[PDB]
């Protein structure tokens, strides 16, 4: 109909206006400005501890707030809590469903969350008078596989699923307080702000979106990729974020100015990106690839400064401690590695 | 050097390791099967005969099976298929009485072509290079009554034959089995079953026994 055509024309005109406004504020580039800064010295990191005990591929890994304990998830039906300093096992939690793709550790240290291929997010309580680990809540309101889950507090959680929608839950009740919609494809990753007031989501339509926890609607939409988006994370300041795609390219996006700052890609890289993380000061960007090795990039000058190569299979999960002292990497070889 | 509690912590870790090893040694003694289809291909009758994600368990002749049905997913297949990289066999179901039907979404495109392209996508995947496929063609009876009223020239406009129950079935089987592009690493089994049957379990038993023998031969370096 004519109304649909005129609405599409209006949408195209709004897109053109947004593009023109974005081009208006682009006066210079970071590369020219960062030319004068001293380059980062070539970096070597070594494997300090190796963690073994799994018997299948490892899909998820999340650090604790004390920078000593971590949690690992594999498709053998086990969720294992590791003490990194002494390489010990504190808890081994059996799971009813063995098809896991994500896990989360509560900031306080009282709960752990898991889920995947069963539309159910399970919360496990670690401190119990009976002396064991028990199920505290099974949230079931999604129609697709769960990609990522993050905690806001001991009685809140944010979840992204393959049903294009994201949800905010209340653990004590068990109901979706807010639902976020607007994507045109699957959702793979989400990142929480340090202020607990913003979060971004990345989708398989080459798009990132910014959401408010309270109000529940979208402010900004970022495009520029060419394939699926598999990882995303914030800069420690909170005014920028890094996106990793399946087209062998990472990009850095700014929130104050809705634009793209820098891209990180090399000719020899033809594989995808599975994990992205930052350092404590925001100078080093760590990326995990399917070429069985991880790379370190300078966040300002876009030059590679180091390669971590100790895994025999695809690197699936990468994490950096809160104090910025060690880096944890996992793979489908059923081994975790701590690098310093 | 360690204190009195560090030794107890190490003992707890050792006990956890022992339990994990004991559970892993038991989890490997199970046969795993992945069941696919095209929605109305007849999954229910197959499950009823041989009995997010659905898990089914059964036992035949001291062999323990474990069948995974993932028909109720409704998402992109390429983002979670690699989870099933080490499955013993894939059971594919095709309802061949849909050569005349058409899909609800489009009146120009028929269901059999969707089944064929899904089979082509699954067979030539990068994760299933050495995975056996067991193809069950379902509800042949309704086919044998329906073939006389309407021919199968509607689906394939390049078929010339006697238009009987045997020639059409042979043509369909040949068309399905010609989509394979390995012919050496992968082997395809075909069978015809109806609603009332009792020999499907024996067929899958023979197939999985052959796969087990081949895997053991490969493990010893003698293959």
């Amino acid at each position: 109909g004519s109304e649909l055509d005129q609405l599409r024309q209006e949408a195209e005109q709004l897109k053109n206006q947004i593009r023109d406004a974005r081009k208006a504020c682009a006066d210079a580039t970071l590369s020219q400005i960062t030319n004068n800064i001293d380059p980062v010295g070539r970096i070597q990191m070594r494997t300090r501890r190796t963690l073994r005990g799994h018997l299948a591929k490892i899909y998820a890994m999340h650090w604790g707030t004390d920078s000593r304990l971590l949690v690992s998830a594999s498709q053998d039906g086990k969720l294992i809590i590791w003490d990194s300093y002494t390489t010990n096992k504190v808890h081994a939690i059996p799971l009813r469903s063995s098809w896991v793709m994500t896990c989360a550790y509560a900031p306080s240290g009282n709960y752990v969350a898991c889920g995947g291929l069963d539309n159910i997010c399970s919360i496990y309580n670690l401190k119990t008078r009976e002396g064991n680990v028990r199920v505290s809540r099974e949230l079931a309101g999604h129609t697709g596989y769960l990609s990522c889950c993050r905690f806001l507090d001991d009685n809140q959680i944010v979840t992204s699923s393959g049903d294009t929608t994201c949800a905010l839950w209340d653990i004590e009740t068990g109901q979706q307080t807010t639902t976020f919609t607007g994507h045109t494809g699957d959702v793979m990753s989400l990142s929480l702000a340090p202020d607990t007031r913003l979060f971004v989501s990345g989708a398989c339509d080459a798009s990132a979106k910014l959401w408010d926890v309270r109000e529940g609607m979208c402010r900004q939409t970022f495009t520029g990729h060419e394939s699926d988006i598999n990882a995303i994370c914030f800069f420690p300041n909170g005014n920028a974020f890094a996106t990793g795609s399946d087209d062998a390219t990472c990009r850095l996006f700014d929130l104050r100015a809705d634009q793209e700052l820098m891209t990180y890609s090399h000719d020899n890289i033809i594989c995808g990106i599975t994990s992205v993380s930052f350092s404590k000061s925001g100078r080093l960007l760590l990326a995990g690839y399917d070429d069985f090795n991880c790379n370190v990039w300078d966040a300002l000058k876009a030059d590679r400064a180091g390669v971590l190569a100790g895994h025999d299979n695809r690197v699936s999960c990468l994490g950096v401690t809160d104090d910025g002292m060690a880096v944890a990497t996992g793979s489908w070889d059923s081994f975790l590695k701590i690098w310093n | 050097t360690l204190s009195a509690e560090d030794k107890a912590a190490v003992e707890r870790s050792k006990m956890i390791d022992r339990n994990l090893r004991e559970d892993g040694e038991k989890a490997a003694r199970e046969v795993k099967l992945l069941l696919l289809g095209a929605g109305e291909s007849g999954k229910s009758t197959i499950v009823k005969q041989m009995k997010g994600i659905v898990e089914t368990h059964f036992t035949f002749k001291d062999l323990h099976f474990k069948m995974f049905d993932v028909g109720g997913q409704r998402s992109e297949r390429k983002k979670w298929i690699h989870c099933f990289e080490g499955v013993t066999a894939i059971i594919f179901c095709v309802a061949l009485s849909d050569y005349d039907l058409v899909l609800a979404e489009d009146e120009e495109m028929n269901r059999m072509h969707e089944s064929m392209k899904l089979f082509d996508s699954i067979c030539n995947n990068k994760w299933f290079t050495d995975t056996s496929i067991i193809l069950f063609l379902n509800k042949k009876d309704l086919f044998e009554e329906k073939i006389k009223k309407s021919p199968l020239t509607i689906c394939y406009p390049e078929y010339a034959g006697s238009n009987t129950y045997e020639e059409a079935a042979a043509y369909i089987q040949c068309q399905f089995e010609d989509l394979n592009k390995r012919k050496d690493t992968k082997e395809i089994y075909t069978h015809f079953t109806c609603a009332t049957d009792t020999k499907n379990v024996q067929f899958v038993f023979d197939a999985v026994t052959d796969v087990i023998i081949k895997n053991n031969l490969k493990d010893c370096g003698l293959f």
Partner: single-chain antibody
Amino acid sequence: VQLVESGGGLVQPGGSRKLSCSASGFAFSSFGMHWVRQAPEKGLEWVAYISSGSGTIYYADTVKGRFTISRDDPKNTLFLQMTSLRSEDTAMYYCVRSIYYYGSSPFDFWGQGTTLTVSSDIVMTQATSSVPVTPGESVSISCRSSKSLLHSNGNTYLYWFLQRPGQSPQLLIYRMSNLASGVPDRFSGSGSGTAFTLTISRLEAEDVGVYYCMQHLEYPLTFGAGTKLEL
């Protein structure tokens, strides 16, 4: 959760007898077990310890060779066999749970006690033996040892617990800085090296009893003489 023990009768100066304890409410197989002996009108001392899996068994020097420990996991029952009894083995016995991992709180439940009547080591010193007090004023108790309890890993193995009259001991503080579960925030602990202080800010009617400090660097486990507190 509750542990109930029995089997205690009167025996002649020469004989044998066995005691049993049954637990209900927790995973028994994942908890190590301790036996504690308290003499009449005296302090309490450690006797024996059995670990999870029955791999490590520890006895005291004063009872080595005479007492036997055993565990039954399917039936959830811990036994103790008294083979030869002197005249000094007349006391009341407790049963204590223990768990050991990063962040654990061992010696958390004590259960009840059973009475039995017959017809190198770190010394723990508490100089104070009685303290008169009026409710509403802060109180401090001091505890000292012969060797520093600080280890190379940064942990100090000091324990503070309480005993009410006609009741069983309850844990208050573990590792001299961590407040246990189910206890008010009034209590606090601190110290350094060999000197340790336990402070109570506000005292009420339920704070009257005997207080004990304990070490956990090495076996055997040694308790200190009680510091009674009177209203």
